[PDB]
Amino acid sequence: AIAREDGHLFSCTVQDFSDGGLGIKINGQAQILEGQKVNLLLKRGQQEYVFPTQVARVMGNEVGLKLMPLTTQQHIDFVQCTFARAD
Amino acid sequence: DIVALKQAFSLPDIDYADISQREQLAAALKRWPLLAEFAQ
Amino acid sequence: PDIDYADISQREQLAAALKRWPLLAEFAQ
Amino acid sequence: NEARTAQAATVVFSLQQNAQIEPLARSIHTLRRQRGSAMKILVRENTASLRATDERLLLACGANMVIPWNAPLSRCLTMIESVQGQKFSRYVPEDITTLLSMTQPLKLRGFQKWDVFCNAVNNMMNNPLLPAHGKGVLVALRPVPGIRVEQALTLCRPNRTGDIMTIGGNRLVLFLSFCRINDLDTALNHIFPLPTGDIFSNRMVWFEDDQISAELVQMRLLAPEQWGMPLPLTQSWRRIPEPMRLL
Amino acid sequence: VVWPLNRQPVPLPKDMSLWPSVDIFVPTYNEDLNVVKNTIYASLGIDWPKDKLNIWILDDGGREEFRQFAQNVGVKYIARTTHEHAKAGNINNALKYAKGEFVSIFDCDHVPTRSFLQMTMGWFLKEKQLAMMQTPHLFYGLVQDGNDMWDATFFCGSCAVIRRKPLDEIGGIAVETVTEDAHTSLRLHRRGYTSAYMRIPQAAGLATESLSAHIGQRIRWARGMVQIF
Amino acid sequence: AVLGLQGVRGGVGTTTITAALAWSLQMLGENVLVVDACPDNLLRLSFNVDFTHRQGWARAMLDGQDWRDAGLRYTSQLDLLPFGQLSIEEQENPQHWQTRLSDICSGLQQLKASGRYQWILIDLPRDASQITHQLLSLCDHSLAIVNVDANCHIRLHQQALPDGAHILINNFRIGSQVQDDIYQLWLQSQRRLLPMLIHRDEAMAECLAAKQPVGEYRSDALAAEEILTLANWCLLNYSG
Amino acid sequence: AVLGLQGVRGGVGTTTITAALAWSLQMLGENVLVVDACPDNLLRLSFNVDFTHRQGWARAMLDGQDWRDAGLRYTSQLDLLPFGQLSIEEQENPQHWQTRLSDICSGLQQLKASGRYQWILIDLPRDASQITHQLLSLCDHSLAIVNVDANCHIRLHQQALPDGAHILINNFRIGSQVQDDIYQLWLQSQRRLLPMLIHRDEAMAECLAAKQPVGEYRSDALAAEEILTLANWCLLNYSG
Ligand SMILES: Nc1nc2c(ncn2[C@@H]2O[C@@H]3COP(=O)(O)O[C@H]4[C@@H](O)[C@H](n5cnc6c(=O)[nH]c(N)nc65)O[C@@H]4COP(=O)(O)O[C@H]3[C@H]2O)c(=O)[nH]1
Ligand SMILES: Nc1nc2c(ncn2[C@@H]2O[C@@H]3COP(=O)(O)O[C@H]4[C@@H](O)[C@H](n5cnc6c(=O)[nH]c(N)nc65)O[C@@H]4COP(=O)(O)O[C@H]3[C@H]2O)c(=O)[nH]1
Ligand SMILES: Nc1ncnc2c1ncn2[C@@H]1O[C@H](COP(=O)(O)OP(=O)(O)OP(=O)(O)O)[C@@H](O)[C@H]1O
Ligand SMILES: Nc1ncnc2c1ncn2[C@@H]1O[C@H](COP(=O)(O)OP(=O)(O)OP(=O)(O)O)[C@@H](O)[C@H]1O
Ligand SMILES: [Mg+2]
Ligand SMILES: [Mg+2]
Structure with a gap:
């Protein structure tokens, strides 16, 4: 999920990811502008973790987000929700 | 996540004990008196 | 209640607010 | 760097952040102490970077004229070419430390005792290196009979270090440093809930050095028993309710 | 591969005070901080x-960024004075300072899933003689x-x-061959x-690896097997 | 079937959730009739009903008219039964009329026997009234709307939920520590919690202003998708 | 003297606001008595009262005991009178006891005439009960709590507030276009709206979990400052 400052919440699917950030594909039409601080909600089991990101590149429905300086617990939550998956 | 792993195989009797969840719950009960009072 | 809806449409921001949301426009009439 | 080689070329500075006030002021002092009076130093605010005291400091440092951000580019250039043909005839002291010290002579925030408050206000008013009739404003507020004066003291949350408050004689006495009479209401709204006048019945305002000194002399002749203290500090772990009978 | 054992995890005792202590080792030599941070x-x-898990970072480069990261996140960090025997010698030196009942080793590229020790340590707590357990990093998986049927998983x-x-009794990780792992299993x-083998994916991190890695492993393995023989 | 939505606390989001659920069910091909029973009577406005429209089943029965005449045709697969506006004296004196609204129950049983509408959604208030209890009994399934806050956690352990009622979480906020703590506690202290959560979406705030269901207002919002998932779960489970 | 805080809608935060206001008044040197008129009795839990403490004025009156012995003292300038826990059967049938709490009005009148309590806050619910109307009648001043959203805006035009009730805003978000529109509309349309509004602060969400008023729990929070400003305004205006 992607949450704007306006309170709009949009479902999305992550295309690719790395330590620099994540590139996602957004379902439906959303006029997300680059440089806008948004919140990325990731689902871990039955929990939701919110990570603050800034959009650095938009390619149509493909949106690239970059992580602001994270904390330790936030980093662990990110690595649990991204790499240490059930795959 | 854990359910997906247990579905990809049998794993019928391995009850998962989430240390992180238990520690967070214990800290929450230590921090918020109302939750501690109601839980026990 | 004490409601004074007279002379409300004289403001641009208020007019935009009434136009954007039909509920507010319906109540303000 | 290029200015230290030039002798009379116009120097227009553009300021965007408040942190760059002191070093830029120091550099302007350096230019005024190295390149003579023929040079033309100008300051151009961009969005919001200067206060009245800081503007006066820049003027004393050697700035020929400060251009506020409110003026557009065209008026900025118009004034820049207006200053043409003028020499800096003012005196700039060798030491920048005194000029920096004039920017903030109180350096103490929060509630103060009546004796301490009077001493600090008088010391600020007795500093020769401050503008005349522009050092600040002293205001006495008379609370509405709905509330007492200590509650009024607890109401106010001033934000600048130069603001000081106290309680005495059923009156709230406030000293605001480097505040003009015209924008007193703005300062009150910044240091109070908005509806001022619904929180006090009447006010007395002084903005002149002689008037402030006379008011200080009058205030010094008050009984110590009427001097108040902050309510939360005097009033002040989990508190278990003790059962009792309401009678 | 006539009869794959298809071993499955043994549940741990419900008393969390009966669980053992595990020391995770992440040895690195020249990998960037980005790889090891994950x-x-x-x-x-x-x-x-x-209280039953200690994480150790074993950087052979003495890099200060790794030390800063270890101090920030709290994981332990040890760098050796010398650099003999490469990874095997690094782990042998680190073993002199660890105090846990079990030693787990993870590569920099591998991402350990949170259900690793839960699904692994049951057999160690159950079968006393079990000294080594391996998890998959296809053909290799089934071999x-x-x-594991014949107790030959290395x-x-x-x-x-x-x-x-047992690891300290055999003189630590073998250092006489390029493939220290196979020689340690043989000893x-x-x-x-x-030895056991559990076919449960961890997080597998790296994808494809290409034939560049495929040949690295294929060769370092043949030379080690020849030396062991 | 007959599903009744009731909130454990005022202002948890029961009415908006009910309207969105009705729209989501009707857009999947199921005929849905939704009835407004709360005396506040705020369910009509979500379906472009004029405020001056005072027609409602409660007022119809209070004036001796037929309650069935107060229905409105919103879409071919959604009909509404507005409660109706009450006068100030009536609002301040509920006892004078709260016992005279029982006739709707047997009529609703007749409607259940009609078979025209495959779903009968009811906006169940929490006034602890006789009509509320009767309607709750008439409901085949009950959904209790709660929020993850201190008040709802206190209420769940000192107030009685409907028999067999399942709990739905509304207004799930972002970056709240106490919310995370209480949700983690409820993950094991409660067995009736649904696996789906409704977030704090601005679309849900703006839907009532636009007089449209959130899905109709904007179907790309996550709250609308969550309501659709809830509708799918109800179809898969609350069919009988 | 009497300041009854009642919610236009459930869940606006009447109880936490009442506790914060009482604490702010007692922090200014005024004698404060808080009376929880809500049948659910959630105000006691905000003052470090054990959840098993069944005592309350309503419980004593129903059991025939003297409600005056049910008082609990928090501090020297703050006294509490919780409603008292009610059994499930009593909650299911509120009508069997709604008329049995008549003497509390006389008791509150005696307390007001005593002069020991300069301010007597009453946490009122919204159920249009006879006891609620009697408490409103004996209340000198009222404060109706609303939130900046479509629901409260709708409510403000059809339901009648008690006479003399100023309007207070709580849970005000930052950066919501609909909320800003509704706030401006209320500024230019609602004459009784108070100048003070309370932003959404997690301190208010954590005060009840910490079983303390927000003033005592965290005085530096913005919510505490806004509540103190509201208390000073109430002292200035409602004193006579
Ligand atoms: N002593 C005192 N005076 C106060 C205070 N608040 C407002 N004023 C007065 O109000 C004038 C106009 O402030 P403004 O309209 O916000 O416009 C201000 C503002 O945008 C900016 N500014 C100056 N200092 C600060 C600061 O510390 N923070 C921020 N955010 N802006 C500042 O510079 C503009 C001009 O400031 P000035 O020339 O100093 O002129 C200031 C000053 O004399 C206060 O707390 N104490
Ligand atoms: N709009 C407005 N707000 C005002 C004004 N005066 C004070 N404030 C408010 O008061 C806060 C505290 O400022 P301070 O105590 O003077 O402490 C100030 C001051 O020491 C310094 N500072 C900022 N701008 C200037 C500037 O233009 N000149 C100087 N000399 N110092 C500045 O930075 C500190 C932090 O200030 P802030 O973070 O901005 O936060 C400021 C601001 O929110 C004013 O005239 N207008
Ligand atoms: N998930 C949500 N996110 C944001 N706002 C919501 C959400 N759900 C409901 N709301 C808003 O909350 C307000 C109240 O919701 P609603 O009226 O449905 O609740 P209720 O329990 O029926 O309240 P009441 O009957 O006491 O008026 C409305 O303005 C609505 O738009
Ligand atoms: N300004 C606020 N910011 C954040 N949370 C708030 C705020 N005001 C209230 N809350 C939270 O909202 C919930 C409802 O508040 P409260 O407990 O006072 O309920 P209430 O309005 O008395 O409702 P009821 O009468 O139905 O119990 C609580 O969990 C409270 O912490
Ligand atoms: Mg409702
Ligand atoms: Mg309440």
């Missing part, structure tokens, strides 16, 4: 009691499951758990100890 973050996220160099006392088998 592995360490995953290791801290492993579902296991905090290692078939080997250390693959990463994502494994080794009992501390463990020679003294009567048993």
Whole structure:
């Protein structure tokens, strides 16, 4: 999920990811502008973790987000929700 | 996540004990008196 | 209640607010 | 760097952040102490970077004229070419430390005792290196009979270090440093809930050095028993309710 | 591979005070901090009691950024004075300072899932003679499951758990061959100890690896097998 | 079937959730009739009903008219039964009329026997009234709307939920520590919690202003998708 | 003297606001008595009262005991009178006891005439009960709590507030276009709206979990400052 400052919440699917950030594909039409601080909600089991990101590149429905300086617990939550998956 | 792993195989009797969840719950009960009072 | 809806449409921001949301426009009439 | 080689070329500075006030002021002092009076130093605010005291400091440092951000580019250039043909005839002291010290002579925030408050206000008013009739404003507020004066003291949350408050004689006495009479209401709204006048019945305002000194002399002749203290500090772990009978 | 064992995890005792202590080792020589940060973050996220898990970073480069990261996230950090015997010698030196009952080793590229020790340590708590357990890093997967039938599953160099006392008894990780893992497994088998294999994915991190890695492993392995023979 | 939505606390989001659920069910091909029973009577406005429209089943029965005549045709697969506006004296004196609204119950049973509408959604208030209890009994399934806050956690352990009622979480906020703590507690202290959560979406705030269901207002919002998932779960489970 | 805080809608935060206001008044040197008129009795839990403490004025009156012995003292300038826990059967049938709490009005009148309590806050619910109307009648001043959203805006035009009730805003978000529109509309349309509004602060969400008023729990929070400003305004205006 992607949450704007306006309170709009949009479902999305992550295309690719790395330590620099994540590139996602957004379902439906959303006029997300680059440089806008948004919140990325990731689902871990039955929990939701919110990570603050800034959009650095938009390619149509493909949106690239970059992580602001994270904390330790936030980093662990990110690595649990991204790499240490059930795959 | 854990359910997906247990579905990809049998794993019928391995009850998962989430240390992180238990520690967070214990800290929450230590921090918020109302939750501690109601839980026990 | 004490409601004074007279002379409300004289403001641009208020007019935009009434136009954007039909509920507010319906109540303000 | 290029200015230290030039002798009379116009120097227009553009300021965007408040942190760059002191070093830029120091550099302007350096230019005024190295390149003579023929040079033309100008300051151009961009969005919001200067206060009245800081503007006066820049003027004393050697700035020929400060251009506020409110003026557009065209008026900025118009004034820049207006200053043409003028020499800096003012005196700039060798030491920048005194000029920096004039920017903030109180350096103490929060509630103060009546004796301490009077001493600090008088010391600020007795500093020769401050503008005349522009050092600040002293205001006495008379609370509405709905509330007492200590509650009024607890109401106010001033934000600048130069603001000081106290309680005495059923009156709230406030000293605001480097505040003009015209924008007193703005300062009150910044240091109070908005509806001022619904929180006090009447006010007395002084903005002149002689008037402030006379008011200080009058205030010094008050009984110590009427001097108040902050309510939360005097009033002040989990508190278990003790059962009792309401009678 | 006539009969793959298809071993499944033994549930741990419901008393969390009966669980053992595990020391996770992440050895690095020239990998950038970006690669090792993910592995360490995953290791801290492993579902296991905090007082029973210690994470160690073994950087051979003495890089100060790794030390800063270890101090920030709290994981331990040891760098050796010398650099003999490469990874095997690094782990042998680190073993002199660890105090846990079990030693787990993870590569920098591998990402340990949080359900690793929970699904692994049951057999160590159940079968005493078990000294080594291996988790997958296809053909290799089934040769290692078939080997577990005959107790021939060998250390693959990463994502494994080794009992501390047998490991210290055999003189630590072997250093006489390029493939220290296979020689360590052989030495463990020679003294009567048993090895296991669990075919449960961790997080597998790296994708494809290409034939560049495929040939690295294919060769370093042939030379080590020849030396062991 | 007959599903009744009731909130454990005022202002948890029961009415908006009910309207969105009705729209989501009707857009999947199921005929849905939704009835407004709360005396506040705020369910009509979500379906472009004029405020001056005072027609409602409660007022119809209070004036001796037929309650069935107060229905409105919103879409071919959604009909509404507005409660109706009450006068100030009536609002301040509920006892004078709260016992005279029982006739709707047997009529609703007749409607259940009609078979025209495959779903009968009811906006169940929490006034602890006789009509509320009767309607709750008439409901085949009950959904209790709660929020993850201190008040709802206190209420769940000192107030009685409907028999067999399942709990739905509304207004799930972002970056709230106490919310995370209480949700983690409820993950094991409660067995009736649904696996789906409704977030704090601005679309849900703006839907009532636009007089449209959130899905109709904007179907790309996550709250609308969550309501659709809830509708799918109800179809898969609350069919009988 | 009497300041009754009642919610236009449930869940606006009447109880936490009442506790914060009482604490702010007692922090200014005024004698404060808080009376929880809500049948659910959630105000006691905000003052470090054990959840098993069944005592309350309503409980004593129903059991025939003297409600005056049910008082609990928090501090020297703050006294509490919780409603008292009610059994499930009593909650299911509120009508069997709604008329049995008549003497509390006389008791509150005696307390007001005593002069020991300069301010007597009453946490009122919204159920249009006879006891609620009697408490409103004996209340000198009222404060209706609303939130900046479509629901409260709708409510403000059809339901009648008690006479003399100023309007207070709580849970005000930052950066919501609909909320800003509704706030401006209320500024230019609602004459009784108070100048003070309370932003959404997690301190208010954590005060009840910490079983303390927000003033005592965290005085530096913005919510505490806004509540103190509201208390000073109430002292200035409602004193006579
Ligand atoms: N002593 C005192 N005076 C106060 C205070 N608040 C407002 N004023 C007065 O109000 C004038 C106009 O402030 P403004 O309209 O906000 O416009 C201000 C504002 O945008 C900016 N500014 C100056 N200092 C600060 C600061 O510390 N923070 C921020 N955010 N802006 C500042 O510079 C503009 C001009 O400031 P000035 O020339 O100093 O002129 C200031 C000053 O004399 C206060 O707390 N104490
Ligand atoms: N709009 C407005 N707000 C005002 C004004 N005066 C004070 N404030 C408010 O008061 C806060 C505290 O400022 P301070 O105590 O003077 O402490 C100030 C001051 O020491 C310094 N500072 C900022 N701008 C200037 C500037 O233009 N000149 C100087 N000399 N110092 C500045 O930075 C500190 C932090 O200030 P802030 O973070 O901005 O936060 C400021 C601001 O929110 C004013 O005239 N207008
Ligand atoms: N998930 C949500 N996110 C944001 N706002 C919501 C959400 N759900 C409901 N709301 C808003 O909350 C307000 C109240 O919701 P609603 O009226 O449905 O609740 P209720 O329990 O029926 O309240 P009451 O009957 O006491 O008026 C409305 O303005 C609505 O738009
Ligand atoms: N300004 C606020 N910011 C954040 N949370 C708030 C705020 N005001 C209230 N809350 C939270 O909202 C919930 C409802 O508040 P409260 O407990 O006072 O309920 P209430 O309005 O008395 O409702 P009821 O009468 O139905 O119990 C609580 O969990 C409270 O912490
Ligand atoms: Mg409703
Ligand atoms: Mg309440």
